[PDB]
Amino acid sequence: FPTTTKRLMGWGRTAPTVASVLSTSDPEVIVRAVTRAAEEGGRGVIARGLGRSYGDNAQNGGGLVIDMPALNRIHSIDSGTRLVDVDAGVSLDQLMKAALPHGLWVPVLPGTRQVTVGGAIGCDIHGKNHHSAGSFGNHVRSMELLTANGEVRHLTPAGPDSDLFWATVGGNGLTGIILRATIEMTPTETAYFIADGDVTGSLDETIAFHSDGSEANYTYSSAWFDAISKPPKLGRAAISRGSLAKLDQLPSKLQKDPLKFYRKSGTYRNKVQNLTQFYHPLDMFGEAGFLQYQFVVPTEAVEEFKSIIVDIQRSGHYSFLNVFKLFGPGNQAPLSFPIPGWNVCVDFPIKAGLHEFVTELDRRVLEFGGRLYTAKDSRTTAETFHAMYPRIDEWIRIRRSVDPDGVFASDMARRLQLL
Ligand SMILES: Cc1cc2nc3c(=O)[nH]c(=O)nc-3n(C[C@H](O)[C@H](O)[C@H](O)COP(=O)(O)OP(=O)(O)OC[C@H]3O[C@@H](n4cnc5c(N)ncnc54)[C@H](O)[C@@H]3O)c2cc1C
């Protein structure tokens, strides 16, 4: 085993640990890494992708961490079936580039493309198109999961160990190492969006804006809101909504290569945009000076959702950067973050009182029927987490089925009692 010793941290740059990291482009060397741990039984193993998760789910202090990005080969891309067969360490960035010439679009994109296929599945990631496309797990056809008995299992969403499939989706790697997957891509005639922009003047307008049925006219939607001004301005937002452009909707110059790659206001229509124009401000979150916090509360819990936003602004913890989105229906994964409702990611300068205020937020999110997102948590308690996810015991049951001895472990699994 080629291993080096590395100090590791998540994107939040908090709670670093040291571990042994194995990188290899050979799946075989990883299967062997697993069996020598299913015998050693020290602190366990965890996969790590590109480490874009904020907290501590992709590290294992004094354990073994597998550097999955080294295992980044694309096996095949088929315009016909729309299927793409990929090592788990392939970037969505790498994948999008390889797939674009074939008229194929990564079906769920987060705000950064430096995420592996494996981490996308591990956190069941969502994008601006959640209300139309659900989360990344919804698009997975199969995965090969290396389990603690050193076996590589072929898993599918409906099929024999379907429950295992769904506990892996959003399982934060605690089910075993995903080595390879087949994703069903989205067909596109173009690499561009056609987008509408709008600005609201308050929280209540922001909410009404999302609640008229409008969202059905766009496959992609999100908003950046003001969380610093006092009502009536609190919650005013710049909304950006769009769908992938068809070839006949581009200007002729872009119609040349369609699969490539007055004051400017937040108000505009039928504007042609590429991915990075269209995805602002979602890309710029992690640039430990800042604590990110993301929650969703159910659609019906409107006054309760507004009350969170009101309290944030009263607290004096100022988040300049954020995101607001209305999620659509969730999937079958027991620990998948998204449920229908109001989703917000906020970004607070760390200072006296922050951690305590966010504990207060947790209790409210929890009280209102909502949850926190593991990809963005460095911080919450095991007890709150378990209460936010009513299917957690079911998931722990599956988890133990497949790793009775605790071969797969992370700092997060300890912190949140997932083992
Ligand atoms: C700037 C920025 C913007 C973001 N925007 C969004 C967004 O819009 N929506 C969203 O949902 N998320 C967003 N995220 C979160 C990010 O998409 C997730 O944290 C994703 O999991 C990170 O992928 P990664 O490859 O870096 O995984 P890591 O962070 O390295 O891993 C995260 C989890 O996946 C597991 N994992 C990784 N590889 C494997 C494998 N082969 N097998 C099993 N498990 C594995 C890990 O063990 C760990 O538990 C954002 C993050 C950043 C920094």
From Swiss-Prot:
It is found in: Periplasm. Disulfide bonds: none annotated. One of its GO terms (biological process) is capsule polysaccharide biosynthetic process. Pathway: Cell wall biogenesis; cell wall polysaccharide biosynthesis. Its EC number is 1.1.98.3. Is inhibited by 8-nitro-benzothiazinones (BTZs) such as BTZ043; BTZs are a new class of antimycobacterial agents that block formation of both cell-wall lipoarabinomannan and arabinogalactan via inhibition of decaprenyl-phospho-arabinose (DPA) synthesis. BTZs are suicide inhibitors that act via covalent modification of DprE1; the essential nitro group of these compounds is reduced by DprE1 to a nitroso group, which then specifically reacts with Cys-345 of DprE1 to form an irreversible semimercaptal adduct. Monomer. Interacts with DprE2 to form an epimerase complex. Component of the DprE1-DprE2 complex that catalyzes the 2-step epimerization of decaprenyl-phospho-ribose (DPR) to decaprenyl-phospho-arabinose (DPA), a key precursor that serves as the arabinose donor required for the synthesis of cell-wall arabinans. DprE1 catalyzes the first step of epimerization, namely FAD-dependent oxidation of the C2' hydroxyl of DPR to yield the keto intermediate decaprenyl-phospho-2'-keto-D-arabinose (DPX). This is Decaprenylphosphoryl-beta-D-ribose oxidase. It comes from Mycolicibacterium smegmatis (strain ATCC 700084 / mc(2)155).
